[PDB]
Amino acid sequence: MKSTGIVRKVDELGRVVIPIELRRTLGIAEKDALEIYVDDEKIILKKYKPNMTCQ
Amino acid sequence: MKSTGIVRKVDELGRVVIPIELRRTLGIAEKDALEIYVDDEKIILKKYKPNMTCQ
Amino acid sequence: MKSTGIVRKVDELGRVVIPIELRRTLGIAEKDALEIYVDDEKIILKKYKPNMTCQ
Amino acid sequence: MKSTGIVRKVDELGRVVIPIELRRTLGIAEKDALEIYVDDEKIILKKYKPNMTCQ
DNA sequence: ATGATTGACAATTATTGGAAACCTT
DNA sequence: AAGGTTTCCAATAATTGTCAATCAT
């Protein structure tokens, strides 16, 4: 009902943050690594995956 | 080709720092608000209209 | 500045500036090598010679 | 001073230089601009050109 | 109130610029 | 010699991690 998903300001240090209300209510998304899907002009971030290219 | 993308490492406590490569390549100013839509376990990060900015 | 056919400034003493992303794209370290060749009147920059599997 | 196809070592830097023979043949300024373009995994640098980002 | 989340600041590392040394006509 | 080129070092700054303050139930 709050600002769980829609838009948020990016930090001046170049960091995007997850809405407080979202993470504070449902920790259904961990933080450490994520999959970057560059869909033309939109960056879709999915759950972390191995995808190891080299040791 | 399958459901996979670029493996990005962010902060283990949060701070979703999008790829530095794309940041400078596309020229994404990190001083405004970016759209963040939650889709199950993935989040769509984009601008109001990134397909009509440098175009 | 990506290599999408974009020009960039050289240097007061003449030095080809390699952008962060470009350096990372080539996969070269601060202990690598670059083969400088020429085609007609253009500079052909070739990455380091692996000659070994990624291990 | 032909250095056509010379392997330049990359030390603790990030950017490199262009061989004297190539530099002289280029016929450009010291602080000129080189058109950076890619080729699979190699790079093709042409002479100055009015090519700007998003323009 | 207290533990967890987020934003701010600081430290580290990468890159670009400049100065110095060596080479060549 | 001296002008040119290249290599090394220093400075700048962008980025990521740490963590301390605050708020929600």
Delimit the domains of chain C by residue range: 1-55
Dihedral Cα C12, C16, C19, C24, nearest 10 deg: -150
Distance from CA of B20 to the nearest CA of A (A): 9
Taking alpha carbons only, the member of D36, B26, A52 closest to residue C5 is: D36
Q: Three-class SS of residue B37? A: strand
Q: How far is the CA of B11 from the C1' of E1 (A)?
A: 28
Q: Give the CA-to-C1' distance from C42 to F8 in angstroms.
A: 28
Quote the tokens at residue B32.
């405004």
| Parallel/antiparallel/unpaired status of strands B6-9 and B33-39 | unpaired
The dotted CATH code for B1-55 is 2.10.260.10
Residues D1 and B25: their CA atoms lie apart, in Å, by 36
Pull the structure tokens for residue C44: 């052909």
DSSP D2: -
Nearest nt to the A9 alpha carbon by C1' = E7
Method in brief: NMR
Residue A46 in tokens: 């999915």
Contact yes or no for C6 and D36 at CB 8 A: yes
CA atoms within 13 A on the CB side of B31: 2
D-chain CB neighbours of C18 within 8 Å are 14-16
User: Residue C55 CA to E11 C1' — how many Å?
Assistant: 31
